[PDB]
């Protein structure tokens, strides 16, 4: 409380006094009381260590604990100790610097194991910093550094650190992983499970989306080191949330594995990290009440098998052995049962206030039918602390009431549920309605999701007891189970989620299909529902179902039948159709530009209709990618004066353009300012939330986010033998994107857009390579229209293969002979030249004669 006091009395001098006491307390104390509140001191100390002039004696306190605390401990703490001292290094002046060396030399000699084994990540970062000289000065042990480095694999650690919220260690790890990956691509060691970090990185950026822009940038830069990752191979990610249907009721053995699964998972990691000083009192009690089964010490402290359970994760063992003897009752409460509020009552304040409260005040349901003996009844003491954690235990309790299959408690639920199901919606105030109601729904469905998972195993459990299906009581349960779906009222809940359309789309699809599928079938029912699916399947992002569905039902006006033709490999006819309507209408001109761009016609939309803020994002994107410096200034000069923009989308697209120009002026300093400036936006406003299922949905985001780094990295080349040696890295780099087309095209074209603008002799000799590389794609990518232009445009360099490469692309075209005559001529052309490869003399004659047979006899 003191350090964290509201400072009505202020006087930080006490903070100096406090560290004295808990410096003294450790000096003389029993080992368990040395552990005891250790979770608290570390927090309560590091919040001291962060304050201005008090930092000195903080480190003074630490060198104490480092000497004697525990060798098996100094895991859960040293972390926040190392990350800090590496970030603030500039602020340590003469003295504080010294004490640090007094810690490390101990950390060297006092612990020759911990850093090398129990926390291997520690040693690498501090050595990684060349400025501290731990590699240079002090011990010879750097041979142990070299030993431990190659051995351990860092990938899993980075997924572990980033999950915590401590704004330093999370800032540290991103700094290493950057410096980590840069070293890889130089030696190109591992092609890859690199996906885990990419799952974690994209979580942080979504957590800090509002807070700390400048970090949240750096989180985006690092995934650009990755670059697309080729969906085709490893989709990775995972399915969905954690419900852990353990069947808590009865089955004492099965009850237990739940209990330990709670404590080391949603309890310790809740109590350990979080700062709510008084709440920490309540967490132990239910832990104790849980350990009340194992409570008696000698039972856990002596007999071999009387416990025998792991009972903790390796980290979770910290608070395990401390409280086993504690049992702090702290149960005093005044009129909880007489305070009962029922039947949609609190729901009034829910919609009035909420996300937290409606579920919080739903603790009234907790303390009503819970807190009697049993097992989980102690959890009333948990929510007693009150809270997004309540959400976790929410279903479990919400189960218990209708599990019983005294009576009025069950029907009191639905009164709020239907009040939650039907809010009359159309809520004038969005801020509350947008916010809480989603969580309500997400909490609402969570039970329904659980029951299905529940009832499935619930019968499948007794399916081992067989008897086909024979139960007396499960009936009333099953009768009640589906009765929980009676509040769904079919379409009511279908439209509950249909009017909501929460970011969970596949569930948004299921019911939406469900209702549409069986019961109504009526004409207008297929009227509105079908139009929803199109929006639905649109967002899942797999265009198959979008095609097949939009084909069958379809109807409306025959203009739609003309629109669908895109996906069928016919689009060249359909795309020829929209150009008609465009030249002639607010949404027309949009559909044209969207299609043309979607099928990767870039050379069109720059030059066609764009010489209404929805089109610029498309228009300014192309001209950026095409890359004529002259046509590009015209855009920027048109964008710059609107006296406003307020569009998240074009700002990303602008800032790339305003960079490219600065290449043409030879201003590597300037072009850094914009490329970085792109990241803050791409990693704030455009980053999605966490999972979002499929990885392929991302390609449009990452593909734009891979090319950037190239444009920054090439423009960072100095001259000549750095440049030429540089592109080889970028050459090799392109391998990890796979063989897919549109991810590749957008990337390699953006190299052309750069490689023209520089206009130095060295840029040239590459520009003839880029095109001919773009030729070999388009051809075997089953587009010969993209190929011919490109290959045509590199004929000015008149490469020796540029001729034959044409004779290639034509021989796929139906006209056989006009092709064949080319190699007929070329093959004899090189005859008597008596030069070039004599290996190249083969390459033609191979392709030559194999034509000479399949073509004609």
């Amino acid at each position: 409380s003191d350090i964290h006091d509201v400072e009505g009395r202020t006087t930080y001098y006490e903070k100096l006094r406090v560290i004295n006491g808990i410096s003294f307390l450790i000096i003389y104390a029993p080992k368990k009381s040395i552990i005891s509140a250790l979770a608290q001191i570390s927090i309560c100390l590091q919040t001291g260590l962060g304050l201005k002039e008090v930092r000195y004696e903080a480190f003074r306190c630490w060198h104490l604990l480092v000497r004697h605390l525990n060798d098996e401990e100094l895991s859960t703490v040293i972390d926040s100790l190392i990350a800090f001292i590496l970030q603030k290094w500039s602020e340590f002046n003469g003295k504080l610097r010294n004490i640090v060396y007094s810690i490390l030399d101990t950390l060297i000699k006092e612990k020759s194991d911990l850093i090398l084994k129990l926390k291997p990540y520690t040693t690498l970062a501090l050595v990684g910093k060349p400025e501290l000289g731990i590699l240079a000065r002090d011990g010879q042990f750097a041979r142990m550094v070299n030993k431990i480095r190659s051995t351990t694999d860092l990938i899993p650690i980075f997924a572990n650190n980033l999950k915590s919220s401590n704004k330093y260690v999370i800032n540290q790890n991103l700094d290493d992983i950057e410096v980590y990956l840069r070293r890889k691509q130089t030696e190109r060691s591992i092609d890859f499970d690199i996906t885990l970090v990419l799952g974690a990185l994209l979580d942080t950026s979504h957590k800090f989306r509002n807070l700390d822009k400048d970090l949240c940038e750096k989180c985006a830069k690092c995934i650009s080191m990755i670059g697309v990752l080729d969906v085709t191979k490893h989709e990775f990610k995972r399915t969905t949330y954690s419900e852990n249907e353990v069947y808590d009721l009865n089955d004492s053995v099965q009850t237990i594995k739940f209990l330990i699964w709670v404590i080391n998972d949603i309890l310790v990691p809740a109590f350990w990290q979080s700062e709510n000083p008084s709440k920490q009192l309540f967490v132990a009690l239910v832990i104790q009440e849980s350990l009340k089964y194992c409570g008696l010490s000698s039972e856990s402290w002596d007999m071999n098998h009387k416990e025998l359970y792991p009972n903790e994760a390796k980290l979770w063992e910290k608070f395990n052995s401390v409280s086993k003897t504690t049992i702090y009752p702290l149960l005093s409460s005044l009129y909880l049962a007489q305070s009962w509020k029922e039947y949609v009552p609190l729901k009034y304040p829910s919609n009035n206030f909420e996300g937290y409260k409606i579920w919080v005040k739903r603790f009234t349901l907790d303390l009503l039918k819970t807190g009697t003996t049993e097992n989980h009844p102690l959890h009333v003491f948990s929510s007693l602390i009150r809270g997004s954690l309540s959400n976790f235990l929410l279903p479990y309790i919400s189960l218990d009431i209708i599990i019983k299959a005294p009576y009025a408690d069950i029907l009191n639920g639905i009164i709020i549920e239907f009040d939650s199901i039907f809010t009359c919606n159309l809520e004038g105030m969005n801020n509350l309605q947008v916010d809480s109601l989603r969580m309500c729904y997400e909490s609402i469905f969570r039970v329904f999701e659980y029951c299905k998972k529940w009832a499935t195993e619930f019968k499948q459990n007794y399916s081992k007891l067989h008897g086909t299906f024979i139960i007396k009581d499960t009936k009333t349960t099953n009768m009640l189970l589906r009765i929980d779906e009676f509040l769904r009222t079919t379409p009511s809940d279908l439209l509950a989620q249909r009017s909501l359309e929460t970011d969970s789309f596949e569930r948004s699809a299921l019911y939406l299909e469900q209702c549409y599928r069986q019961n109504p079938h009526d004409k207008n029912q297929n009227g509105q529902l079908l139009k929803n699916l199109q929006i639905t399947y649109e967002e899942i992002g797999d265009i198959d179902s979008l095609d097949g569905v939009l084909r069958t039902f379809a109807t409306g006006n025959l203009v739609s039948k003309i629109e669908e033709l895109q996906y069928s490999e016919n689009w060249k006819l359909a795309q020829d159709c929209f150009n008609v309507l465009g030249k002639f209408d607010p949404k027309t001109t949009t559909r044209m530009l969207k299609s043309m761009y979607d099928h990767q016609l870039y050379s069109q939309i720059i030059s066609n209709s764009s010489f209404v803020k929805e089109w610029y994002s498309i228009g300014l994107e192309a001209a950026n990618l095409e890359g004529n410096v002259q046509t590009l200034k015209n855009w920027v000069e048109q964008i710059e004066s609107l006296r406003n923009i307020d569009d998240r989308e074009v700002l990303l697209q602008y800032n790339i353009a305003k960079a490219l120009i600065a290449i043409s002026n030879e201003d590597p300093l300037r072009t850094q300012k914009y490329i970085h400036n792109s990241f803050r936006l791409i990693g704030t406003n455009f980053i999605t939330s966490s999972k979002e299922t499929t990885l392929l949905k991302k390609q449009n985001l990452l593909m734009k986010l891979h090319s950037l780094y190239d444009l920054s990295f090439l423009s960072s080349a100095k001259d000549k033998f750095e440049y030429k040696s540089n592109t080889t890295i970028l050459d090799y780099r392109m391998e990890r994107i796979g063989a897919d087309f549109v991810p590749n095209h957008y990337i390699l074209s953006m190299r052309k857009s750069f490689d023209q603008l520089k206009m130095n002799e060295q840029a040239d000799a590459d520009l003839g390579k880029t095109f001919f590389t773009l030729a070999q794609l388009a051809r075997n990518n089953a587009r010969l229209d993209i190929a011919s232009e490109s290959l045509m445009h590199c004929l000015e360099r008149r490469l020796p293969q540029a001729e034959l490469e044409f004779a290639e692309i034509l021989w796929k075209q139906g006209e056989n002979d006009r092709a064949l005559k080319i190699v007929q001529e070329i093959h004899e052309k090189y005859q008597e030249n008596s030069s070039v490869n004599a290996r190249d003399r083969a390459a033609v004659l191979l392709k030559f004669t194999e034509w000479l047979d399949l073509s004609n006899n």
Partner: protein, 293 residues
């Protein structure tokens, strides 16, 4: 507005009579239609990132009209001060003076970002009137419209001014207010009456006008390229320091006139005078003497 200034001053004589008045209430109103330039907030939101077109030419038209106004104000009074003995009493009325408070009281803020181009002209009014009050007698018609609540307010807002120490080398840099009067680089241009600062952008004002097409909208200057010697630090410093050799000469007038009866002198400027007096006597002696400035 600029072109109107060249009109006002040409050969003032007795030419302008009330033409100043109807001019003043207009401009004093026009300055009111423009707030959001001078009322900008002091602190920028952490969650406000800077990525935008970063265009400077819609600011530059915002600033010019603000500045050029505040000269035209001073341009008026200096002209009115050229008119015969009792002719002054014609002009001033509760209408003109009430309108003015909302200008001055708008300029010096203390809740909002300062702007160093108006502060000069914001003061010179507060000066020139108190220089003319003593001259021609029968003070503002026995101060027909001067309210102790009004008046003393206008002075109690100067006490905040004197307390900013204008360290000669931190002038152009960005920092928090009440530290110093910084005069940021984005708006420096000669104004009208006097050339205040080196106006690095003094030549951009011709770069927004195109010069062929006959266009309404500006030509889109860019904030990146606007603005190696320190010496321009000293000048803007010195030329700034006069301002504190002004707010003094506000005071002597103030002591002459009211004869100490009202609450103005009872506010004990000797509190704020001396607290200023003692300061320089500390800093001048310690940290300055000998550095050749």
């Amino acid at each position: 507005v600029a072109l109107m200034y060249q009109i006002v001053q040409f050969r003032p004589s007795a030419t302008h009579n009330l033409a100043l008045k109807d001019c003043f209430l207009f401009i004093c109103d026009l300055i009111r239609i423009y707030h959001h330039v001078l009322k900008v907030p002091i602190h920028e939101s952490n969650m406000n990132l800077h990525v935008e077109p970063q265009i400077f030419q819609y600011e530059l038209i915002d600033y010019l009209i603000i500045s050029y106004s505040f000269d035209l104000l001073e341009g008026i009074l200096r002209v009115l001060q050229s008119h015969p003995k009792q002719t002054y009493m014609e002009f001033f009325d509760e209408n003109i003076l009430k309108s003015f408070e909302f200008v001055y009281k708008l300029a010096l803020t203390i809740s909002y970002k300062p702007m160093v181009n108006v502060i000069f002209s914001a003061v010179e009014v507060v000066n020139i009137i108190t220089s003319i009050i003593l001259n021609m007698d029968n003070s503002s018609d026995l101060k027909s419209l001067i309210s102790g609540s009004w008046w003393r307010d206008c002075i109690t807002r100067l006490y905040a001014l004197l307390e900013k120490e204008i360290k000669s080398g931190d002038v152009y840099n960005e920092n928090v207010d009440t530290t110093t009067l910084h005069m940021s680089k984005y708006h420096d241009f000669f104004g009208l009456i006097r050339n205040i600062g080196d106006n690095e952008l003094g030549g951009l004002i011709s770069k927004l006008i195109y010069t062929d097409r006959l266009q309404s909208v500006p030509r889109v200057i860019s904030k990146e390229d606007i603005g190696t010697a320190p010496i321009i630090g000293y000048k803007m410093e010195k030329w700034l320091l006069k301002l504190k050799d002004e707010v003094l000469n506000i005071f002597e007038n103030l002591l002459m006139i009211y004869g100490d009866d009202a609450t103005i002198v009872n506010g004990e400027m000797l509190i704020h005078s001396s607290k200023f007096l003692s300061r320089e006597q500390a800093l001048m002696i310690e940290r300055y003497v000998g550095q050749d400035s």
